[PDB]
Amino acid sequence: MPFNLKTPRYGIEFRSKLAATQFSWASPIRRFRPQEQQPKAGDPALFLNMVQEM
Amino acid sequence: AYDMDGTGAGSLEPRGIKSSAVEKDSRCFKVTFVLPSQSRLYTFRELQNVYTTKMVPFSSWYAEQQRIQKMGGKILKVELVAGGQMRSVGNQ
Amino acid sequence: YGFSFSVLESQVKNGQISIKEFVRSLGKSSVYQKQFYQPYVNSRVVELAFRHFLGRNLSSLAEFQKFFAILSKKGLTGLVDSLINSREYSDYFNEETV
Amino acid sequence: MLDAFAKVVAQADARGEFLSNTQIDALSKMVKEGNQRLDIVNKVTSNASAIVTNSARALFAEQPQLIQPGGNAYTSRRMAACLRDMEIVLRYVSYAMIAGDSSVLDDRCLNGLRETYQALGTPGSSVAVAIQKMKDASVALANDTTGTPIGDCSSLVAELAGYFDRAAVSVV
Amino acid sequence: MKTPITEAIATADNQGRFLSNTELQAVNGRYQRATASLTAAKALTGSAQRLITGAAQAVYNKFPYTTQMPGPAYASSAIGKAKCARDIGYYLRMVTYCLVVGGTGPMDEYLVAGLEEINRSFDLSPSWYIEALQYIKNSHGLSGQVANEANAYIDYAINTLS
Amino acid sequence: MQDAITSVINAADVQGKYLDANSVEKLRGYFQTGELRVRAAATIAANAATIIKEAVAKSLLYSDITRPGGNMYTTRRYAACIRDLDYYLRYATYGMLAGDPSILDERVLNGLKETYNSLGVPIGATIQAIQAMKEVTGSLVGSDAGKEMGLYFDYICSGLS
Amino acid sequence: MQDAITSVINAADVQGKYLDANSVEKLRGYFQTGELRVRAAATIAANAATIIKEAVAKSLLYSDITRPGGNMYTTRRYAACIRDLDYYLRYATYGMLAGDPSILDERVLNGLKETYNSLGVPIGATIQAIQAMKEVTGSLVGSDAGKEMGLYFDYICSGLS
Amino acid sequence: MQDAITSVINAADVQGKYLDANSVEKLRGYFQTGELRVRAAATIAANAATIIKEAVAKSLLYSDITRPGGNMYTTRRYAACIRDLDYYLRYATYGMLAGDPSILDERVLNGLKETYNSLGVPIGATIQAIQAMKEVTGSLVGSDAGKEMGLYFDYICSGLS
Amino acid sequence: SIVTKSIVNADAEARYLSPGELDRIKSFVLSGQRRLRIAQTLTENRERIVKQGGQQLFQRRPDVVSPGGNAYGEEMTATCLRDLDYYLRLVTYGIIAGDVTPIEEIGLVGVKEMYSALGTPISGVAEGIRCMKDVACSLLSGEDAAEVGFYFDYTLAAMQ
Amino acid sequence: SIVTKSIVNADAEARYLSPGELDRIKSFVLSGQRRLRIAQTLTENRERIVKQGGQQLFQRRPDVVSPGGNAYGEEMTATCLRDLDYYLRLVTYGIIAGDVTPIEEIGLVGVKEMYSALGTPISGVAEGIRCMKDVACSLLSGEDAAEVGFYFDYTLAAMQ
Amino acid sequence: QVGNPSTRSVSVGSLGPKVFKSEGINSNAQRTNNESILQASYLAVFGRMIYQNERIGLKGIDNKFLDNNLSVKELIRSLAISDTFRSLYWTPLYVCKSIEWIHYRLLGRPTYGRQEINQYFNVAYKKGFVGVINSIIDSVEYNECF
Ligand SMILES: *CC[C@H]1/C(=C/c2[nH]c(/C=C3N=C(/C=C4\NC(=O)C(CC)=C4C)C(C)=C\3CCC(=O)O)c(CCC(=O)O)c2C)NC(=O)[C@@H]1C
Ligand SMILES: *[C@H](C)[C@H]1/C(=C/c2[nH]c(/C=C3N=C(/C=C4\NC(=O)C(CC)=C4C)C(C)=C\3CCC(=O)O)c(CCC(=O)O)c2C)NC(=O)[C@@H]1C
Ligand SMILES: C=CC1=C(C)[C@@H](Cc2[nH]c(/C=C3N=C(/C=C4\NC(=O)[C@H](C)[C@H]4CC)C(C)=C\3CCC(=O)O)c(CCC(=O)O)c2C)NC1=O
Ligand SMILES: CCC1=C(C)/C(=C/C2=NC(=C/c3[nH]c(/C=C4/NC(=O)[C@H](C)[C@H]4CC)c(C)c3CCC(=O)O)/C(CCC(=O)O)=C2C)NC1=O
Ligand SMILES: CCC1=C(C)/C(=C/C2=NC(=C\c3[nH]c(/C=C4\NC(=O)[C@H](C)[C@H]4CC)c(C)c3CCC(=O)O)/C(CCC(=O)O)=C2C)NC1=O
Ligand SMILES: CCC1=C(C)/C(=C/C2=NC(=C\c3[nH]c(/C=C4\NC(=O)[C@H](C)[C@H]4CC)c(C)c3CCC(=O)O)/C(CCC(=O)O)=C2C)NC1=O
Ligand SMILES: CCC1=C(C)/C(=C/C2=NC(=C\c3[nH]c(/C=C4\NC(=O)[C@H](C)[C@H]4CC)c(C)c3CCC(=O)O)/C(CCC(=O)O)=C2C)NC1=O
Ligand SMILES: CCC1=C(C)/C(=C/C2=NC(=C\c3[nH]c(/C=C4\NC(=O)[C@H](C)[C@H]4CC)c(C)c3CCC(=O)O)/C(CCC(=O)O)=C2C)NC1=O
Ligand SMILES: CCC1=C(C)/C(=C/C2=NC(=C\c3[nH]c(/C=C4\NC(=O)[C@H](C)[C@H]4CC)c(C)c3CCC(=O)O)/C(CCC(=O)O)=C2C)NC1=O
Ligand SMILES: CCC1=C(C)/C(=C/C2=NC(=C\c3[nH]c(/C=C4\NC(=O)[C@H](C)[C@H]4CC)c(C)c3CCC(=O)O)/C(CCC(=O)O)=C2C)NC1=O
Numbered sequence A: 001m002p003f004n005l006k007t008p009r010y011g012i013e014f015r016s017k018l019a020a021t022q023f024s025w026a027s028p029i030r031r032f033r034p035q036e037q038q039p040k041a042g043d044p045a046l047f048l049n050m051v052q053e054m
Numbered sequence B: 001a002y003d004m005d006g007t008g009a010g011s012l013e014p015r016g017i018k019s020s021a022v023e024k025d026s027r028c029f030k031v032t033f034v035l036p037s038q039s040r041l042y043t044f045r046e047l048q049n050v051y052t053t054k055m056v057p058f059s060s061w062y063a064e065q066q067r068i069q070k071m072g073g074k075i076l077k078v079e080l081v082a083g084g085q086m087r088s089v090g091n092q
Numbered sequence C: 001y002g003f004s005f006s007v008l009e010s011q012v013k014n015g016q017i018s019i020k021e022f023v024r025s026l027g028k029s030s031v032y033q034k035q036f037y038q039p040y041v042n043s044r045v046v047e048l049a050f051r052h053f054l055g056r057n058l059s060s061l062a063e064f065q066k067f068f069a070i071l072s073k074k075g076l077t078g079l080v081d082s083l084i085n086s087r088e089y090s091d092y093f094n095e096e097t098v
Numbered sequence D: 001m002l003d004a005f006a007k008v009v010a011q012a013d014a015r016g017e018f019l020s021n022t023q024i025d026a027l028s029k030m031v032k033e034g035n036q037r038l039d040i041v042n043k044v045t046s047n048a049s050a051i052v053t054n055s056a057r058a059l060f061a062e063q064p065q066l067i068q069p070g071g072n073a074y075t076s077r078r079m080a081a082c083l084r085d086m087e088i089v090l091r092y093v094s095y096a097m098i099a100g101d102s103s104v105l106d107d108r109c110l111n112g113l114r115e116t117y118q119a120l121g122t123p124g125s126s127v128a129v130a131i132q133k134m135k136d137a138s139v140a141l142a143n144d145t146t147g148t149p150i151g152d153c154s155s156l157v158a159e160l161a162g163y164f165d166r167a168a169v170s171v172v
Numbered sequence E: 001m002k003t004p005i006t007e008a009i010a011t012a013d014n015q016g017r018f019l020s021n022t023e024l025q026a027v028n029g030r031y032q033r034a035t036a037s038l039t040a041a042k043a044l045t046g047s048a049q050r051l052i053t054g055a056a057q058a059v060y061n062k063f064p065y066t067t068q069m070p071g072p073a074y075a076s077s078a079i080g081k082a083k084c085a086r087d088i089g090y091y092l093r094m095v096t097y098c099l100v101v102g103g104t105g106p107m108d109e110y111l112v113a114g115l116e117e118i119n120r121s122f123d124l125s126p127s128w129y130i131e132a133l134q135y136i137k138n139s140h141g142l143s144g145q146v147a148n149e150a151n152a153y154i155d156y157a158i159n160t161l162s
Numbered sequence F, G, H: 001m002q003d004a005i006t007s008v009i010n011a012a013d014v015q016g017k018y019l020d021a022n023s024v025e026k027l028r029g030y031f032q033t034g035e036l037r038v039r040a041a042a043t044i045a046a047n048a049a050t051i052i053k054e055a056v057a058k059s060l061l062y063s064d065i066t067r068p069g070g071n072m073y074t075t076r077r078y079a080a081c082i083r084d085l086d087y088y089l090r091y092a093t094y095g096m097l098a099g100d101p102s103i104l105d106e107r108v109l110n111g112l113k114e115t116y117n118s119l120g121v122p123i124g125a126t127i128q129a130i131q132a133m134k135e136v137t138g139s140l141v142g143s144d145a146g147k148e149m150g151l152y153f154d155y156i157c158s159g160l161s
Numbered sequence I, J: 001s002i003v004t005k006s007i008v009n010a011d012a013e014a015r016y017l018s019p020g021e022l023d024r025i026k027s028f029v030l031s032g033q034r035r036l037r038i039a040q041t042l043t044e045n046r047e048r049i050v051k052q053g054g055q056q057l058f059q060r061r062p063d064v065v066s067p068g069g070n071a072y073g074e075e076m077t078a079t080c081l082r083d084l085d086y087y088l089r090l091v092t093y094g095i096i097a098g099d100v101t102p103i104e105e106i107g108l109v110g111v112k113e114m115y116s117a118l119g120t121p122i123s124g125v126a127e128g129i130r131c132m133k134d135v136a137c138s139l140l141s142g143e144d145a146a147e148v149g150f151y152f153d154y155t156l157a158a159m160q
Numbered sequence K: 001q002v003g004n005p006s007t008r009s010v011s012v013g014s015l016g017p018k019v020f021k022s023e024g025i026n027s028n029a030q031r032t033n034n035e036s037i038l039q040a041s042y043l044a045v046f047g048r049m050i051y052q053n054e055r056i057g058l059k060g061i062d063n064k065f066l067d068n069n070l071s072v073k074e075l076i077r078s079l080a081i082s083d084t085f086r087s088l089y090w091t092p093l094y095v096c097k098s099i100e101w102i103h104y105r106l107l108g109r110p111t112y113g114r115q116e117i118n119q120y121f122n123v124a125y126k127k128g129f130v131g132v133i134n135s136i137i138d139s140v141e142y143n144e145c146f
């Protein structure tokens, strides 16, 4: 890993302690994936990323 | 569904009290009575209040009034608090 | 599950209806027949009703045939009315004891 | 780092055989498309600073809370860092277009980019929104038939679209 | 139905006369060309689902807003993606009908008569179908006069939409 | 209970007569305004929680009843307060549908004045709370529907005083 | 109990899916026949006493079970037995309206075979009375609704053997 | 078991009658269509492994019934399911040849709904596979034999429902 | 379903259905074409109705997604929108069933006990359903938007 | 386990476990900690074992992935590696159980009937399991690959 | 058999099931149904056809029968005392539910009462699973009927 992508400007231990004054953002909405389209154990759709690396 | 479907003597269902209430009747009285136990001196259950004033549906007043009389009780007052008098339809 | 019979409770807390009248309108309710009338046959409904409105089991064969015939002819409310309007209920429970 | 030819050499180097004469025809088909490759890259590297700022402006109208006071990309210190962060993704996507394979995209850019947005608290789903804003601007500019002969280039813009939605699923 | 056979009958019947050699020569040219036309009709039929599913994808990669916008006119849900691939299979089925018949007769009545009233009413854009028809032209994989007979009825559809 | 349809069947049956012209006219008066009640009945059932929340805060929220010692003090009192207001709102909606206030005398006003006097509930405040519930409910169903709705709110307050 | 509509909803909800095209066609199959079932249900309720009266005369009236020694000899056993036939007719009508034999499992068939074995009632003669009652019903309601009613008459007999 | 000829001989024996015109009509009805049954029975025996392989993939191949946790997940459970479909197809051909579904009652359907309810086999998914097996076989044997073959696939699902 | 409640109600009395009860079944099967079409229009607008509904909910209730709220985080907000999809799916079942009994038997019986145990504010789930009602009611006509809104307001009343 | 077959073998004879029969059970539990380490190695290398085993299976049998083969396509090829993931899991079960019964009872009984009914070449599935064996025996020591080699070998012989 | 104890072996006819007999009738006395009596034996013991993986262990038994080296009694016995039969109908069952089932397969009827079910339950307590099979196949009702 490159070191600028290893150690950023601040870590998880400085960000989590200031969630009252600073770093209060709450996160926007993700793209809505329906729950019944998600793969379960024994589905061949969990190996399509393996097949595209062939 | 109602107690007056023709069941009388010589039928398969045992003889009981028959009411003149319609299906899902909604008339209720307001009664007052005293009903002693007359059996506590050989069962020895706890003592209970026997002076009662309660609202009883029209569908059960013939059986309740007939039960209070068999068991020595005395009915002190009865009034109709819900429902119309001599109404043809609209008792449901 | 958060069920509630709100008009029945205020009438029984105030004294307008007794506990016998509270139990009777809980038998002919919709929550009761949804749970103890629909998923069962008429034979099993007569036996479970004796456990809820009388606190005991059927004793004889002529006692089943008398109450099976009432349920078969008048449904749920014709059965629950015949159990609370009986002398055995008032003997053990007189208008105020659950 | 590999190019497209290096992944065919280093694959059969591990098998240890000579490169077959039917594999040379796949490498010679690539150099026939070698000059249609070079003006997909020239179309996107020349409008590079307007693919970025027109996609950020479309992002900040959909999700206005990223730039409002108390938001992540609020101040002028951090608007500039958000604007830089899409310039770096567009840089390495065009690097993996000119090489033919994505081995420099997921090595110096995507190698742990997800784990530093959990440490910074940056919403990683919103960076993958603004990458698909840049994908829609870059495949529309690679269909530009000005200063170029007309031909079918649909298989190479579908490869440029592949490196855009690889860098979007690697931050979420 | 514009067929070479029925354009010959209607030419002789405009003036109330029998079929001369002006008309038997016109339907001779249908039969010489029918060999190349009937081999394109089997090749476009046998690779239909490869061409329909490939050309529906060609519109989404060219117009990405059609899979993102909300509304009944766009292919953002599964209902709109099924009505899109239904239309591409309508355009491919009309082209094989014209190669069987010989002229631009089936897609005149069944496809293009009244089409621009439909695209204006239901807010459908005709540039989506030009992009889909230009995928089928570049990917039927035919050659020779078999390809020239197929490309002519594809280009006839592109000129009606433009 | 008897609605507008049953009330005209009753008047005819006590004479042994069929439904004559004066009877069929009253029946059209109900049918013509029927789908307007069904629309107003669904609008109040959807805004039932807010019709009571704004009536209570506007009528009796910071008064002496909510203070210690006053009536409606404990949470049991408060929950019994707003449980009563929903009873009136739910039964006045039954009367507007049937077009006859007979259901209010059997299941609401059945000796309710004696019960409130024994318990010590302020009758003057409950009548003004129902009145405040009539001015917010009228804003929803309009005047033409608000005319029928208010016809029964005054029936409860008049049968309560 | 669950009808043909709720049976489709539960099949989809148990997977977490919305109603797709395969389930929408089952929903259309029930709506198209809804007016045919309501029409047969009204004619069966009016001819119930004559369906039972003619299925009994045709199957078990002058048989051995009506004489001394057989099952249903005394008048209580004749009256208790045609009360059973009035169960099957009424519950076969509920199943025809709902288009699902679910109500026959819960409220009719669950534990009905053991009841007859303890009482001593012949199952073979009961199945013949329901089959004779299926033929009389099929002539009153027609040939289309008549074979729907027979669909739930056979569920009782096969659920009883 | 009794075939179509035996069912006609027994129906006349129970009456004490020589074979009349009505029973001779039912005898010819079987003799005429008899060679159409020997052809369908010979084509089903040849495409047996194909009719099952196409109804499985059509109905229950990529569902959650084959994934881990589903009834029929492991290879023992998979091989046990396609062995059940082999009996239904094989027994619906015995019934089509004999022209009488008596073979299905005595050897297939007796206590079969109690057997699946004990093991946990889904009855709904089993009926779908037989419905899929009904149309895949109806395309091979034609329109005449395809309808009589479906007569005994429906007899199995009806008693299994 | 409308048919189910008519059959169980006439079983408690041990009798057949009356003409007034059978006409409610005829009147209901006649509207089957309109119900199957309204449910289809909502099923085709899942991502917009669910996404639009949860977007407005976080402006009327910004605390639920801020630091400390129940739905704080991307994975929590994802399950946040998962719940709204449950009730949209249940609403399509009620529109097709002809009554609100599927919405009750699935996700309204014991709803206050479930959400109090998970630590979720039940008042926020009812605010999120009221926002989905405005989005879903803007895709329909004058008459179809009126009845579809009644199925959304019923869920909110039973959720308070 | 050997415990299960030792009790079923002694239960049928209606007697208690034998003296030597008990010594086998004691020797099994003393090696249980070592069995957990071998099975732990394959569990964290599962995707690499399936990939390399998947690649080298398509070079020794290109007919399975060519036009006309069973695993032709990217979705049908995904079902290839899915089945390879199953059997790699079942061999980890047999390593911890010290026996082949977890493999045999899960995916060995009815394996000929199952693959014969799918149209899948049973001859090729054994080839893929043999290609997964060398990778698994490549990540283990001299005698650890001799332990895992028993379970990989039993699966192939039963698949022919 | 309770009002006619001597009716044992006398074939019922077309009212009963099909009876398979290793006959060997010919002008040279050759058995031509060795492959049908073996198929009928698996269906009598197991009721179905076992899987190809579990039938592998029994191939040594089928090879000796098809070679005309085993009787039907020694074939039925060698199938019932196998470990695939034991793993199906003895181990996963209540001990008296296995005797009631195993008795119904080897002999065509269920037990008469307690004097017959207690007799085998004592043979199982002492000898085991194999002792129960041999006591039914060496029975007197078996040799008289089959
Ligand atoms: C519109 C963009 C979203 C956003 C971005 C944002 N990012 C940062 C900070 C960093 N991003 C990286 C990632 C890389 N840096 C690199 O140099 C490379 C190539 C080697 C990568 C892949 C790193 C290290 C940082 C930290 C500083 C930096 O180098 O840029 C910030 C600033 C963080 C701060 O609080 O100062 C922002 C605002 N944030 C959003 O709101 C948008 C969704
Ligand atoms: C897919 C490429 C794009 C797309 C398709 C889309 N089309 C429709 C609706 C219609 N399409 C037609 C076209 C024909 N009907 C015919 O019979 C023939 C000849 C055989 C043709 C060419 C018509 C008439 C309609 C409207 C009526 C109908 O729905 O059948 C829709 C639905 C639009 C609506 O409002 O219902 C869609 C989504 N849309 C895209 O975005 C794709 C890029
Ligand atoms: C260093 C700078 C540099 C470039 C910019 C390119 C520029 C470039 N492209 C082409 C040649 C070409 N360029 C294109 C490209 C396109 N046609 C389209 O419709 C698309 C819009 C577009 C790319 C996406 C095509 C299709 C050809 C080949 C013509 C053909 O085969 O039909 C040629 C001619 C080559 C020859 O004659 O053999 C040149 C010089 N090459 C370079 O070395
Ligand atoms: C002892 C039994 C008893 C209780 C408990 C009681 C409660 C009661 N609490 C109120 C609460 C209230 N409580 C708060 C409390 C808050 N807490 C916080 O942590 C937030 C910062 C804030 C918002 C929730 C607020 C703001 C109100 C007034 C609401 C309003 O009128 O807008 C009011 C309305 C005004 C009034 O006081 O009359 C009553 C009657 N009454 C009683 O007899
Ligand atoms: C054994 C002692 C005893 C008696 C007598 C008794 C009577 C009694 N009669 C009743 C009603 C009634 N009684 C009558 C009777 C009559 N109408 C006429 O015109 C007549 C002159 C009269 C017939 C002789 C009618 C019509 C009603 C119904 C009233 C109504 O529905 O409005 C009711 C109300 C409940 C019900 O009807 O089911 C009771 C309790 N209860 C008892 O415990
Ligand atoms: C369906 C028709 C119907 C009504 C209306 C009804 C009323 C009724 N209101 C009650 C109490 C009450 N009602 C209130 C009401 C109020 N306090 C105020 O300040 C306001 C003026 C008013 C709001 C309307 C309060 C505070 C109590 C509790 C009294 C106590 O617990 O002592 C009680 C006693 C039972 C209980 O404690 O819940 C009944 C029975 N019952 C019925 O069956
Ligand atoms: C021990 C108690 C007991 C009784 C009473 C009884 C009656 C009884 N009466 C019957 C028929 C009958 N009963 C009658 C009787 C009459 N017709 C008239 O006009 C007169 C009013 C009346 C006689 C005085 C008739 C005509 C039939 C034949 C009806 C038919 O076949 O449709 C039948 C049907 C066939 C049969 O006889 O088995 C039974 C079972 N069964 C019993 O177990
Ligand atoms: C809702 C589903 C349901 C059914 C059907 C049901 C039936 C039922 N039938 C009964 C009796 C009976 N059922 C019959 C019926 C018959 N006799 C015959 O010969 C015919 C074959 C048959 C008429 C078709 C007879 C005669 C008795 C009385 C048995 C006795 O008194 O010993 C009894 C015992 C009660 C009594 O003796 O009255 C029950 C509980 N229970 C249920 O819960
Ligand atoms: C745990 C024990 C166990 C196993 C092993 C198992 C296998 C199993 N393998 C399947 C398919 C399959 N397997 C393959 C495999 C291959 N194609 C080839 O050419 C190669 C020879 C081979 C890969 C090495 C293919 C192509 C399918 C899908 C066939 C079809 O869909 O028609 C399926 C059908 C769909 C699904 O995956 O659910 C099941 C159930 N199930 C189990 O419970
Ligand atoms: C069909 C009827 C039905 C419902 C409704 C249902 C809800 C349900 N909501 C859950 C969690 C949750 N629900 C929420 C909900 C919310 N957060 C907010 O800010 C909003 C106010 C609110 C609504 C969007 C959150 C954040 C979680 C995850 C809680 C956690 O992970 O700590 C969970 C636990 C995880 C899961 O299995 O998904 C269930 C079971 N289950 C059901 O069967």
Ligand SMILES: CCC1=C(C)/C(=C/C2=NC(=C\c3[nH]c(/C=C4\NC(=O)[C@H](C)[C@H]4CC)c(C)c3CCC(=O)O)/C(CCC(=O)O)=C2C)NC1=O
Pocket: K094, K095, K096, K114, K115, K117, K118, K119, K121
């Ligand atoms: C493997 C599981 C299993 C068990 C346990 C089992 C027991 C069993 N115990 C029996 C009898 C018996 N069991 C007892 C037992 C007892 N008497 C007492 O006082 C004690 C409290 C108790 C023993 C501790 C007696 C006295 C009998 C004889 C009953 C009789 O002869 O009527 C019988 C009937 C024997 C026969 O009729 O041939 C069986 C089958 N069967 C099984 O399949």
